[PDB]
Design a protein around this nucleic acid. Structure first.
Lengths: 105, 78, 97, 95, 84, 84, 99, 105, 95
DNA sequence: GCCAGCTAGGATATCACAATCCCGGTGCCGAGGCCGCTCAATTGGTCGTAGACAGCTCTAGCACCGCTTAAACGCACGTACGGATTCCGTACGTGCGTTTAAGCGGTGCTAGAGCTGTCTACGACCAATTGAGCGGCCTCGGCACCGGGATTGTGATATCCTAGCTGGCCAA
DNA sequence: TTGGCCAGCTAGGATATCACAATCCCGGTGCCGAGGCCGCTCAATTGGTCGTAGACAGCTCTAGCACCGCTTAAACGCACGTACGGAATCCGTACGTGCGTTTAAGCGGTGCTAGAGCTGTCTACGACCAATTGAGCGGCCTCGGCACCGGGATTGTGATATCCTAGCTGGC
């Protein structure tokens, strides 16, 4: 059976494991390491996907639009402050307006 | 409060500066002189008042720059 | 006749272009540019279609990101126009020549 | 045609079920997600590999992994993610 | 093939309009744009160079998008959405 | 008996920040500067030592070697020379 | 009449004085004790190598100065000869320091 | 005999070679690669040392002072523009004065 | 005492002869030079290693090295340095 | 009521000085230089294996053509914001003058980091199997574009209200 | 007669008024990117080996920490004072806003090539094992450049004295 089932997870732990062997990082690879990294990736995908959809039904689409990923990463510090040098194809920019730009009153 | 030229000649009397009083000094002494001045027209009203005090001869000019009669220092005629 | 006040229009397209994500330049000039600037490094080069897509996307992203910085600089300068001096100042701060 | 782009697509797409069983996706966004995860991967890998060489080990294991993750990930990510990995490893050893 | 010249004006005056707009700036001085034409023109230099070096390393003479993305990521300019 | 210290952020004195800025080629400074600078400094420190200590404990050390520090600095692109 | 230097004289003077010298500027003891508190929160009872704190001070001083000259450019662009905080967070944000 | 002699060089080509093997970079190492890198390091040391000394006898010392390295890297674009995130212990800063700071006239 | 800091010190110090047979050195500066060269080393190493993995090679050789060097080093460095490496490799193969 | 001397200020040439640079000598220590150990280097034979070469096809890069409109380009024009001026207020430099606490040197304590030796839990190797994941084809339901009305928001106007203006009325 | 009181003009500013078009929100459609489905397969999945990298226990000594007495000198507080920053004014222009004319790039559509990825073949070279040795590292001794100190040269700064010259008050 699959360790992923034995881990209850979605990424192929043995596949990441071979990535490590042909990742040319260390000569020796502990087993649980791959599981642990897989769980990390589980979670990371979790926020990014969920909050993209969060934005998604906000302008009420049924499917994810890279607009929405772009916005999704914009509104959270913990994400953008993780993703500085990150530029997104067809991402666009978050809606920001500067105050003094506005008409006086 | 009376009309502008009265305050202008008043602050002329109260300011014994050797070069008189700058349009800056004129305006700031006017604004520090009366509260009901309606601050939305002091610059224009005072500028026209200075023009009329100069053309009438009420205002005399110790030092100014040409074509900036509204940008300079004035004195009362005596 | 009817006439708009200065900048009101400007703000309109500010919002317009801050809503969508398309490509803001016209292609053929851009790929032309890519070609000659490539010429200087090797003769008779060749590009994939997607390569220039990445080129334009990175380019426009870089330009808009530095533009907003220049805008902030002007805002600092008690200022609503962008002047070259703002450009060099921001460029210096980010530290590229 | 006899080639394989061996992405992560099925995986992340299967992910987007249990949280949002109703939502769709764009192919471009899908590609961005793939590129994303391969990124976060090899940065974690680079971190840990540098680490063990410092520590003159030859082995990469979950403990140095968890430090490296607690290194790169800023904020409350660092806590929830490590917790999930702990529990995941925990149930795995349970056979 | 033919040697082409001076399409730097090809970044047209109104194009720098659009860029300004997405940048959220209101009004512009004239002297910007050639300066703009300056900065853009340098930037591509720094990347395409790297890109072509990537290409010729693999004994290539057709530029893949992958070449571009590697060149960018080395410049701390990570871009997503194109291949891997 | 364990030493617990308090509010030494003020320990950076008025002439301290003065002389530092003086190195920076500034002659004229506001009195309102000092407080944020010490705050500024503070955050940068809380940035560095954070990973550094994790580095140290990664080795099961509870004394910090300079190497921990230098690797920390390295990680934010703040390469320091001379110590390792 | 005691002699007086007009203002900015001493300014430029030890601008040269410090812009030529190389020693450490902050008193080491206050620095290191500051380090000790700021470390305490993350883990208790932490032992510090002598070289480590000196490295900290070196890097910190470098950071602070490097920010200072940039703030100087910010202020001069303001046609001002004085630094004000607004310059400081201006430069900080342009560098991209989210805080 | 030493390849370094057979290369006429100063860095230990076989030593860098073992660095590569325990550098965990590739499973396979071509021989000339180490020589090539060694020559690079030769040159790099050449500019840095020579121009530090260049500065050195300028204020007329007999020995190198990290002041002088700091200055040495400052005056050349090709070096500093290579060495941005580089901070030097007891380096200090190059002598720079801003113009408007000066007295008017 | 039974340990070895196996620096590059003798090497760079022997270098400073043939250019400046008369000059001295500070120990701090010497350490900075060591840290320097180990830096430029592992950055070159990282470059080349990334390269061959792109090129799905398993071998690191002087050709990919020379590209990587021509990559990182800006300007006329890139030319003189590659020339020196070429000639050095050249005489080496001459046995 | 009108002219000279007084007087004030302002620009320019001149002096004093104290902060800085430069010098010779002193001593001090960090840099340099020699000697002894060894392990991490060279050196030689091997295999097998990634890599060089060679040929093909067929996929994508590329030239080219016609058309269109949509975007660009050149032009008036004015207004609204930039830039130069002044100036007044003060938050600043800056130069006493005191005090502490930072440095510094020393000592005593220790523990915690590090090196030594031990065993063993576990991780690659390898052969064998499969079912899970790639991709290729089809369908369909979400959505981009088209067209029309409604709301807000903007720009101009007419009015209201007000303060100052200017002339008429009355007492000195 | 005439200057002050008054009262109504007057002009302007503030203010509410109305008019339009820009976007938004609504429908409607064909269009196509997502998705379901099926077929192929290769990395994953098991089990056993065997080795070995790490885990633990057991020391020692080094470096860190804490305590202690001088020694300032750097810092703090404070007085004084001015030159800078805010502010505000005023003038000039240049760039946004509109218009009218042009054209050139998308597009789409097609014919055309070469070069990229594929297969298949040969081999040189580097990982590997064991032997050998000397260059490198540390350890020790040393001495020659330097930092410090002290004792003159210089000068950029702040003050000063001269001069001039222009607007006011005494004299004739």
């Amino acid at each position: 059976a699959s360790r992923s089932a034995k881990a209850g997870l979605q990424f192929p732990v043995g596949r990441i494991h071979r990535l490590l062997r042909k990742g040319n990082y260390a000569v020796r690879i502990g087993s649980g390491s791959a599981i642990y990294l897989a769980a990390t990736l589980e979670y990371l995908c979790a926020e990014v996907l969920e909050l993209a959809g969060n934005a998604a039904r906000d302008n009420k689409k049924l499917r994810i639009m890279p607009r929405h990923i772009q916005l999704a990463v914009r509104n959270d510090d913990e994400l953008a402050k993780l993703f500085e040098g990150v530029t997104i194809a067809d991402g666009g920019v978050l809606p920001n307006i500067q105050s003094a730009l506005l008409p006086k009153k | 409060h009376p009309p502008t030229l009265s305050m202008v000649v008043e602050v002329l009397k109260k300011n014994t500066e050797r070069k008189g009083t700058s349009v800056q000094a004129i305006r700031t002494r006017i604004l520090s002189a009366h509260p009901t001045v309606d601050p939305l027209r002091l610059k224009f009203l005072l500028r026209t008042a200075l023009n009329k005090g100069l053309e009438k001869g009420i205002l005399i000019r110790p030092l100014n720059s040409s074509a900036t009669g509204a940008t300079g220092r004035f004195k009362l005629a005596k | 006749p009817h006439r708009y006040r200065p900048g009101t229009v400007a703000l309109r397209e500010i919002r317009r272009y801050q809503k969508s994500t398309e490509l803001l330049i016209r292609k053929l000039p851009f790929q032309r540019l890519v070609r000659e600037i490539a010429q200087d490094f090797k003769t008779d080069l060749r590009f994939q279609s997607s390569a220039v897509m990445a080129l334009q996307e990175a380019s426009e992203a870089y330009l808009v990101g530095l533009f907003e910085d220049t805008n902030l600089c002007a805002i600092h300068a008690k200022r609503v126009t962008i002047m070259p001096k703002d450009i060099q100042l921001a460029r210096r701060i980010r530290g590229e020549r | 045609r006899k080639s394989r782009k061996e992405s992560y697509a099925i995986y992340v797409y299967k992910v987007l079920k249990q949280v949002h069983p109703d939502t769709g996706i764009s192919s471009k966004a899908m590609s961005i997600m793939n590129s994303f995860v391969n990124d976060v991967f090899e940065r974690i890998a680079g971190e840990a590999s540098r680490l063990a060489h410092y520590n003159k080990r030859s082995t990469i294991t979950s403990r140095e992994i968890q430090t490296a993750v607690r290194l790169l990930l800023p904020g409350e990510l660092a806590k929830h993610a490590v917790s999930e990995g702990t529990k995941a490893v925990t149930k795995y050893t349970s056979a | 093939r033919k040697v082409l010249r001076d399409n730097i004006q090809g970044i047209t005056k109104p194009a720098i309009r659009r860029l300004a707009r997405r940048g959220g700036v209101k009004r512009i001085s004239g002297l910007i744009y050639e300066e703009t034409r300056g900065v853009l023109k340098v930037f591509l230099e720094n990347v395409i160079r790297d890109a072509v070096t990537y290409t010729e390393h693999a004994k290539r003479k057709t530029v893949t998008a992958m070449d571009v993305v590697y060149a960018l990521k080395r410049q701390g300019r990570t871009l997503y959405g194109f291949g891997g």
